[PDB]
Every structure is written in structure tokens, then in C-alpha cells.
């Protein structure tokens, strides 16, 4: 969405890039201002800039290098144990960037890996959302799993938890 805040934030992450031309007066992209940017320079640009620079330019202006969030180590960790993995630390907008990357390069290995990860994680997500506390007189696991959730998973969990909580409140309303 254009007005979706989460998407605007996601489009602001930095991705590695490598310029392929000689463009004077583009230093501000690099740390230093007002200096020519020589070819083969490596620098991290925001997605909203890097993507359009990569598709526009024959040789485009930049080439996208493999991000560290889609490296072989991360894929192996995803495949080994999806539920235990801490996605929030890898990137807070992992799934959105993954979908954007798949669309940009149309690679299906990543698509299958991400789909399996999402399904397996969603199983435990629903397990936790369905668990509602009770007060006898009138925890740790839930918190540790919540800490690991990505932003989109955190929205889905909130919605499902509220739905379950509303149904339980209606059914047992004295």
C-alpha cells in the first residue's frame, strides 16, 4: 500500500549495491559530499533508491549484491528449526523484504523456503494466540516466543489473540 506505514518503513532498509558507471557529483550517496563516485564502488543504499537504480539505466546504474539476510547461513538456520529461530534480530521486516526480493528476481528456492518457514511459524503463533490465561484466586514461554516475532507476525498474532479473547469473553459472560 502507498499509505501503509509498515510498507513505508520496509522500503527504507539498506541493501548492498555496486555502481557500474562514473558519475561525478553523487558523493552524498557516499559518506563524503561533493565528490565524484568512481565505478565499482560498494555502498549501502535504501531500497526505494536501490531498486529503481537497478532496473533503470544495457548496463543499469547499479547491481544488487546478495543481502546478508538471505545468505546461505540464514537459509540453513531457517530450514533446521523455524520455530526456534529469532527472526526479529535478522530483520524486523523480514517477510516484506523477502516478498519484494522474490518479485524483483523471481527466484523460487527462496519462495519455497519462506513459505515453509511461514507455515511452521504460524502453527506455533496460533498455539500461543489460542492460549488464554485464567485467574484461580479471583507465561515465560509465551514471552520468549513473542520476543522473536517479526512485525507482520506480531500483527497477525495480535489480531488472532483479540478474536479469541472476544469469543471467550462473550461465551462465559455471566
Amino acid at each position: 500500500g502507498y499509505y501503509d506505514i509498515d510498507d513505508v518503513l520496509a522500503d527504507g532498509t539498506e541493501f548492498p549495491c555496486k555502481f557500474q558507471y562514473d558519475i561525478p557529483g553523487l558523493g552524498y550517496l557516499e559518506n563524503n559530499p561533493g565528490r565524484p563516485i568512481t565505478k565499482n564502488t560498494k555502498l549501502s543504499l535504501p531500497l526505494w533508491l536501490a531498486r529503481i537504480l537497478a532496473i533503470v539505466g544495457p548496463v543499469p546504474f547499479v547491481e544488487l549484491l546478495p543481502p546478508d539476510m538471505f545468505s546461505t547461513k540464514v537459509m540453513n538456520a531457517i530450514k533446521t528449526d523455524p520455530v526456534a529461530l529469532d527472526l526479529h534480530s535478522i530483520n524486523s521486516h523480514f517477510f516484506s523484504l523477502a516478498i519484494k526480493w522474490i518479485m524483483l528476481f523471481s527466484e523460487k528456492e527462496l519462495a519455497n523456503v519462506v513459505s515453509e518457514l511461514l507455515l511452521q511459524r504460524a502453527q506455533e503463533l496460533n498455539h500461543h494466540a489460542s492460549s488464554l490465561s485464567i485467574d484461580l484466586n479471583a507465561n515465560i514461554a509465551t514471552s520468549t516466543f513473542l520476543l522473536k516475532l517479526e512485525e507482520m507476525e506480531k500483527e497477525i498474532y495480535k489480531k488472532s489473540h483479540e478474536s479469541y479473547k472476544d469469543t471467550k469473553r462473550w461465551m462465559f459472560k455471566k
Binding site: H128, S130, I134, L136, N137, S143
Partner: protein
Amino acid sequence: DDNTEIIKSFKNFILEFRLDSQFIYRDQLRNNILVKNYSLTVNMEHLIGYNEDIYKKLSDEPSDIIPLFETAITQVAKRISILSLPTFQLILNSNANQIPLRDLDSEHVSKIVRLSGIIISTSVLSSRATYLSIMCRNCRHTTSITINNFNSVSLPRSCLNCGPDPYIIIHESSKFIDQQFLKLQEIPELVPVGEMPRNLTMTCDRYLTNKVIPGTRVTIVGIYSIYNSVAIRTPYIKILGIQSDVETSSIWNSVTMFTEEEEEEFLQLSRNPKLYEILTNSIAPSIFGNEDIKKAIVCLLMGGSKKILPDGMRLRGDINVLLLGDPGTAKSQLLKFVEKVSPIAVYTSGKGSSAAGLTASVQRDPMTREFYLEGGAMVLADGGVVCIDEFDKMRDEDRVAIHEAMEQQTISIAKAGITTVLNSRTSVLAAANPIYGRYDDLKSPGDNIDFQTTILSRFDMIFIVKDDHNEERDISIANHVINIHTGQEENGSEISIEKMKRYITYCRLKCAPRLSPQAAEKLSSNFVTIRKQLLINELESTERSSIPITIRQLEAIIRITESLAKLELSPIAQERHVDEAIRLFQASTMDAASQ
């Protein structure tokens, strides 16, 4: 025979108990199995209400019936979660009268008891067996054993020729659980006349392990039993439930133990326009005046924010406060209150302390002959506040043993082979007297203070409390104290100790403000002016200032600003907090230095 009937009775309680329109225990079980917590907490008032006969059995012979209520829970859990799982733990809650720790004697052996105490030590987890696979040495016959951890079990003595004790355990096919040992000391007030506090050994299983830390008051439900280690047995308590006022799990890991309903209360309180006034008034309601010291104590309890720079340097985020003054000022009472409000705190007297008593000490185990490390006051207070009273009576060496733990927040040891760097992130609140007992204005400030500049510079704020005889103030204090002696607002002007402690925990684990550029420019200009003021004062007097102003004071002002911002859950610290921080610094440390 009777065991099956008992199991059937406890299964019908879990399947038929409704107080209104919700099955409390059936739903608690399903919700626990869904998050992988194989246990059920049952309130004994509910069991006395379903069938009093079931309670009579559970209380008459606890170590025989509790094992039969666990299997009932397991059967119901299988029926509820599996469409045709270890043995479930039973955690008990009770409201029976608490027996004093020292009143437990032969009359309570093998009975359910409730008691309170202070945890002084915790052991490294051990592994107990729950399902052994065994084999015979000679004929190689395979069998299994099942064990419940309720003692009144050993390998078979005769095989099923094979000599005595023919069975060896097959470990790769057995299953084990967790076991922990705890030492419980009685509360200081409960102790009888002229008696040292007494200890008691306790053991917990599975989901009751790693629930407490040394130095926290707890309430225990368990079984007072005995184990043979002549015709005497050493008593111990088999824990069946732990209740504490400290969310140790939240403090060690993330933010936890706060319900959304509880969390909502904290946000509402933070939104109060005058939370600063309420917190200041809530500290020591029974001590008159001393508003600046109470604000300083609020800032010390709140703490600053710690930063780890990319190069690795760490910046202290705690605030240290010194109270120098004349007798009768209520410094010791303020320290005793701060020890009681803070989630973690230790009250120690500088006279009755030592370098090893603080920090950590090296001890030899009499059995293994191996040296190990035991934490002292500053380790026992890690993540909290240490109240060092009588700071002037401490010996020079024992005081010198505190510099690194006060500044770098680490305790480097190199003794008896043991070589390590522990962690001690504590705030020091110290009370002291001048050399002559009273701050004598006639003599120079270098004569009333025996503390060296190195130790003094480590304190963020130094308060030189002077007792001046003013008739109006004297009458006011007399009236206040008489009212205290002969004589509950709780109307938005003061909050109880429990709520304040929980709010401190929430703020510490939820906020860590950062300075905005305007605050940075303001604090930077103020530091330049203060340093110039010390130089003009020094040029005037040949003597070198006894109260120093180094970069540590700039960092202290930053910490005070950040604590004031954190008090209101504000992610950014603005000038409205910088002004208050500068005012407090001028009221304490520049005030002390000016004299």
C-alpha cells in the same frame, strides 16, 4: 484397588469443577498443554468445596496421594489433547496459616505446611531419574522401572545363577528430570530473642526450578519430611509451590510477569501530569522535609541508560549518591526505606563489612578440596542498589576494594587459580559523618572530609546536610514527629511500596531515553561554567578543592537527565528535564563544593 478409586476421584474434579459457566481446571489444562507447560496449579479451597473427603486424604498422607493426583492429571491431559506427554506436575496454592520457620518440629513430619523466608543460596541443577531401563549382567534380561520423586527406591537386589545386585542401568534409553536445592533463612523479625537465624534445606522439581534468586522473600507450600544421610534424620521441605513478590523471571529475561491489565495501569500512571511530585512524596512519607534528597533517591532508583559503543567501550548508567551530614538528619532511615522500596537491595554497615564481604570471596569446598567463588554484597545486589551505612567507619582497604565495582561495574578476581571478571551493576547510596561528627564551618572544607578525591569523584551527587537551629523548622519537625508518634492518603498524592516497586521495575525494563541536541548544548555550556567556577574558587584559596568536578560529573548530569526522562516513559529527554537535573546538581554537589 484404592489407588484406582483415588485417581478416578481426582480426574472427576478436573472434569466436573465449574464455579459459574467455565470449567476452570479443564480449560487451564488445555491452555497449559498448548504452550508446552505440563503442569496444573490447583487451589486447595476449590478441592475443599468439591469434596472435603479428597482434601482429607491429600492432607492426611501427602507423599502417597500427590503421586496419584499427578497420574490423574496426565490421563485427563491425554484425553483432552490427543485424539485416539510426561507425568504432569501438581502445583498447590493454599491460604492456611504460615508456620514460623523455627516452629517446624516433629509434630509436622510428613504434612503440608506453609512458611515464608529469605533465599540465601541456590544450587546448580541436578538430574533425577524418572524412567530407568535396566539389564542383567549375566543373562542379559531387559526391564524398566518408574520412579516418583516422593520418598517415604533402588535397583532390584535379585535377578528375574545371578549374584546380588545383578542389574546395570542402560542410560541411552532412560529419562530424567530437573532437581534443585535451596537454602531458606527465616525473616529477621520472626527470629526469637538472642538467636541466630536458622536455615532449612528445600528441593524443587521440573517447573519449580529457576524460580528464585538469593536474597528474595518467598512463600513456600511443601511437605516437611526427613531423609537419612544413628537414630536421627535431617529434615527438609519438598516444595509444592512458590510465591514471591519479585518478578525474578522478568528481571533476568526480557519484560514478563506484567499482565496487559497491569501494564495498562502503569501507562495510565505515567500519563499523570505530576508523577514526579507523587513519587517524591511517596518516598519516606514519615520523614519531614529533605525534598532534594528524596528527588535524588527517585533518580537513583530510576537509573540512567547504559550504552555500548561500537568500539566496545561501555558507559555506566547508574547513579551513586553520598549523604554527608550531622547526626539526627534521618540518613539511616532514608537508607532503610530505599532498601525496602527497591526491587533488589542490600543494607550493609561500613563498619561490619570487609573487602571480601563486598564483591566476592574465594572459598574451599571441604569435600572436593576445590576453591570456588561466592558473591558478596555487591554481587547479591547486582541490578539493584547497595546501601552502605556508616561509610566513614569502613577501613581504607575495604573502601579501596569498591572503586572498580562502583565505576567499571565489574569485580576482577585472581586468587587460588580462579581468574575471572564478574558483573556488579549496582547503585551505591552511602551515608557518612564528617571528621568531627558535626560539619564545623570554622575550619576549611578540606578538614571536615577525610575521603580522597578519587572515591568522591565516583559519586554523582554529594549532599552535605547541615543541621541549623531554626525555630520555625524546629516547631514543624516537632509537630510532625509527635503526629507520627501518637498516630493513609492514597488519594493520588502517594502510592504504596508495592506499586512503586512494580513501577520501578516496569520503567527500568521498558524505557531508556536519549538526549536531544538542545539538551546536549545546554549541559555542555553548564559544564564549562561549573569548571570555571571551581577554578575561580581555587584561585582565591591556596588549598586544592576537596570536592572534585571532573568529566564524571558531566556524565552524572547526563544520567540524572535520562533518569528524569525515564520516570515518565518519555523516549527522548528534553530541556524540561535538563533544567531539573542542573538544579539538583547545583543543590547537592556545587553546594557541597562552594563551602
